[PDB]
């Protein structure tokens, strides 16, 4: 009962992000790009976050595919969800008026997730426009934002009111 | 059941509201607005309530889509169910005669200020000043169809 959404090139990320959700989203992205490499995709995000490796798999796919991936925060975008939101296409990052976004964040090697993390921090810094130092600080700290605060921070562009 | 209700532009919210129910209702609302961006939707609510984020997602979707969302309380509209009832289209908020509505809404700082953001929507929609709503929310007491009507949560009481 989501395939009809898939047909309109809409993907639903409504659960926490682990390796199964990662594989699902990656497969759907690749599929939508195979069907039409130059027609948009819309990723709706209502996710508590989750595995940094799974979310980085999703992010990599979003970059690699030719279509532009617009991202829309429905309910909440936390941890990797927030990241996946902030990594949406330039100009096409949206949140609904009462959405909330907490870029806070918490099997594989230590150094791996460590520099994986440094990397997603650098990416958040370029996308938001904030100093690295400031993305660095506000990830190792519980904090939440509304669409009005998120858009001031850089994580979204326009609000859909 | 729900497959065929969906064709008559009817959405059934008969369970508690969590993120799965929220994604379901959101998707159905969007779908129904895609099929026809100027034909009504009817949201039947028989809900004990639940998550405030989930409910707020449903609410935002109701606002955004072009159709008007008539809301109808069948059995009971509690917590976010009562809020989603009060947030239906003006003039098309309904309850059945023995329906019942308690607007009693059960990270700490986040939950606080979110509750506070709820009360103010409830106030503008109902008409009650937002003290009248803080006291009621901090209270275990339910209103009948007639009561909810006088109160502003309902537009009409259904009985032809």
């Amino acid at each position: 009962i989501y395939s009809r959404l898939l047909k309109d090139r809409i993907i639903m990320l409504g659960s926490a992000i682990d390796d199964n959700v990662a594989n699902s989203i990656v497969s759907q992205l690749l599929f939508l790009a195979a069907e039409d490499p130059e027609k948009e995709i819309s990723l709706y995000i209502n996710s508590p976050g989750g595995s940094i490796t799974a979310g980085m798999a999703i992010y990599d796919t979003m970059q690699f595919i030719k279509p532009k991936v617009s991202t829309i925060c429905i309910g909440m975008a936390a941890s990797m969800g927030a990241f996946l939101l902030a990594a949406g296409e330039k100009g096409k990052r949206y949140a609904l008026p009462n959405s909330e976004v907490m870029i806070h964040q918490p099997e594989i090697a230590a150094k791996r997730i460590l520099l994986l993390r440094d990397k997603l921090n650098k990416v958040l810094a370029e996308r938001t426009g904030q100093p690295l130092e400031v993305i660095e600080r506000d990830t190792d700290r519980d904090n939440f934002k509304s669409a009005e605060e998120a858009l001031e921070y850089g994580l979204i562009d326009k609000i859909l009111t | 059941i729900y497959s065929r209700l969906l064709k008559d532009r009817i959405i059934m919210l008969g369970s508690a509201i969590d993120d799965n129910v929220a994604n379901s209702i959101v998707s159905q609302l969007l779908f129904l607005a895609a099929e026809d961006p100027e034909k009504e939707i009817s949201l039947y609510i028989n809900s004990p309530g639940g998550s405030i984020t989930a409910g707020m997602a449903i609410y935002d979707t109701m606002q955004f889509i072009k159709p008007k969302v008539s809301t109808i309380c069948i059995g009971m509209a509690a917590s976010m169910g009562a809020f989603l009832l009060a947030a239906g289209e003006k003039g098309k908020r309904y309850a059945l005669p023995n329906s019942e509505v308690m607007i009693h809404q059960p990270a700490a700082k986040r939950i606080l200020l979110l509750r506070d953001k709820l009360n103010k929507v409830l106030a503008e929609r109902t008409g009650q000043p937002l003290e009248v709503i803080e006291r009621d929310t901090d209270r275990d007491n339910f209103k009948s169809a007639e009561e909810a009507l006088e109160y502003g949560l309902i537009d009409k009481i259904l009985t032809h």
Partner: peptide, 6 residues
């Protein structure tokens, strides 16, 4: 969410 997404 269209317009404008998609």
């Amino acid at each position: 969410f269209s317009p404008x997404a998609p």
